[PDB]
Amino acid sequence: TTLTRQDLNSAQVVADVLSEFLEVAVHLILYVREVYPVGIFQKRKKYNVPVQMSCHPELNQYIQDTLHCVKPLLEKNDVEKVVVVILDKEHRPVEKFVFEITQPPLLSINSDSLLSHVEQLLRAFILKISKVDKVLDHNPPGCTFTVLVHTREMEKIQVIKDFPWILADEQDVHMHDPRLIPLKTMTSDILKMQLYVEERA
Amino acid sequence: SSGPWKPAKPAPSVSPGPWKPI
User: Fold this and answer.
1) Residue A124: which H helix or E strand, with range?
2) What is the domain range of residue A194?
3) Which residue, of A20, A72, A111, A149, is most buried by count of CB atoms within 10 Å of its CB?
4) How many domains does one find in chain A?
């Protein structure tokens, strides 16, 4: 039997780990940028560091449903970026948390030491997000969020894992010469990731 | 790159939003 990247157990485990990381990061971003009230969040522990978990079931299901669709792309190494876009009540993007991701074309079949230093890497990103409010201006009241996914290069509507996706428009993904705030860029044998924020200027 | 792609379903508001299919 001939295997493709997605058939590798290691590719599936990494996809699981990264999808969970994105879930933790999305919850944290919503908390620190106050997209949802502090009242719905509860402090929990992840990667041995404090994080904030939404306790609103509907929001939690929405985030899981969304990220569950990114998992297969991660296994196939077809995801370039996952972006959390915060928009004001006028539907204008005010902040964009950009997670650029690159993965090797293959992973070892010798699964040993796969996630060796992964937690230290993910922890670094969470810590940066945790204090991002110190380098960003306060967002206006009534903001909402959307998640954008950029894939590796025909239907306008795509249904993945029973969840519908559509092409985003420059009407909600355009910022004229925005301020770029680097947060963290790290590399490892299984992943290279770069997180930065684009802020409306 | 392909996309960007976004969920057709908008993020839920604190309390369910209004009826507007289109």
Assistant:
1) helix A118-130
2) 1-201
3) A149
4) 1
Q: Identify the closest residue of chain B to A153 by CA–CA distance.
A: B1
Ordered DSSP codes for A10-49: HHHHHHHHHHHHHHHHHHHHHHHTTSS-GGGEEEEEETTE
> d(Cα A132, Cα A148) in Å, to the nearest integer?
20
- Confirm or reject contact between A146 and chain B (CB < 8 A): yes
Coil vs helix vs strand at A62: helix
Q: Length of chain B in residues, anyone?
A: 22
Per the entry, the structure determination technique was X-ray
User: Hey, are the CB atoms on B9 and A158 less than 8 Å from each other?
Assistant: no
User: Interhelix angle for A118-130 vs A9-32, to 10°?
Assistant: 20
The residue written with tokens 């996809």 in the block is A15
Upstream peptide bond of B4 is cis (omega within 30 degrees of 0): yes
φ and ψ at residue A175, rounded to 5 degrees: -130, 120
Max distance between CA atoms of chain A, in angstroms, equals 56
C-beta of residue A198 within 8 angstroms of C-beta of residue A98? yes
**Distance between CA atoms of B13 and B9, rounded to whole angstroms?**
12
Q: Do A37 and B10 touch (CB under 8 A)?
A: no
Q: How far is A122 from chain B (nearest CA, A)?
A: 24
User: What Å resolution does this PDB entry report?
Assistant: 1.6
Structure-token pair, residue A125: 């990103």
Radius of gyration of chain B (CA): 12
The answer for A 35-74 residues in CB contact with B (under 8 A) is 36-37, 40, 56, 58-59, 62, 65-66
